[PDB]
Amino acid sequence: EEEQKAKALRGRMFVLNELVQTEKDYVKDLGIVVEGFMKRIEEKGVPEDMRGKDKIVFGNIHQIYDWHKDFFLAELEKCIQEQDRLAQLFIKHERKLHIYVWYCQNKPRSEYIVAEYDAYFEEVKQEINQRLTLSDFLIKPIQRITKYQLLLKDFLRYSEKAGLECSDIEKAVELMCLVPKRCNDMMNLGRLQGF
């Protein structure tokens, strides 16, 4: 009985540790986009045919990079010591999640320019010594939102099997179900019209 609760509390620390570690790797990956790909492009220059199109490719990813590197990662680390702050962390910053929905809506245009200039961006990748393509990096913010949902769901189960007050955690989960859906809606609307 109380041995089942102890396993459940363990499960819940595990999920938090996975949330923080994948957050560190998420920040590193965004850093490769911003401090690697985008920095290399300023050094390398863009062919005249592409003038300004790099802004469409990267969109608002810097806004996402800064928010996780400078705020969200540290707030998640603080949750390892103060567990109940986790649900409120997602709830209280719901409006900030529009940066992701904004990212999703611009995604079809970005995908087009990345493919249209594939040889150029393949050069950039080589010139920064990365194994993954630019496209494999630019998907990561979209994937990250589904990762938060899956992890908050595991956090929810463990916290239920520990007999804990789950009310604010259910709201956190519901929120991170609605964001991927809105993301997919925006992307699908952006498929209706191109250049």
UniProtKB/Swiss-Prot annotation:
Top-level taxon of the source organism: Eukaryota
Originating species: Homo sapiens
Location of the protein in the cell: Cytoplasm; Cytoplasm, Cytoskeleton
Function: Promotes the exchange of GDP by GTP. Activates specific Rho GTPase family members, thereby inducing various signaling mechanisms that regulate neuronal shape, growth, and plasticity, through their effects on the actin cytoskeleton. Induces lamellipodia independent of its GEF activity.
Family the entry assigns: Belongs to the protein kinase superfamily. CAMK Ser/Thr protein kinase family.
Membrane-crossing segments per the record: none
Note: Called DUO because the encoded protein is closely related to but shorter than TRIO.
Ranges of residues in domain DH: 11-186
Signal peptide: none
Name under which the protein is recorded: Kalirin
UniProt domain comment: The two GEF domains catalyze nucleotide exchange for RAC1 and RhoA which are bound by DH1 and DH2 respectively. The two GEF domains appear to play differing roles in neuronal development and axonal outgrowth. SH3 1 binds to the first GEF domain inhibiting GEF activity only when in the presence of a PXXP peptide, suggesting that the SH3 domain/peptide interaction mediates binding to GEF1. CRK1 SH3 domain binds to and inhibits GEF1 activity.
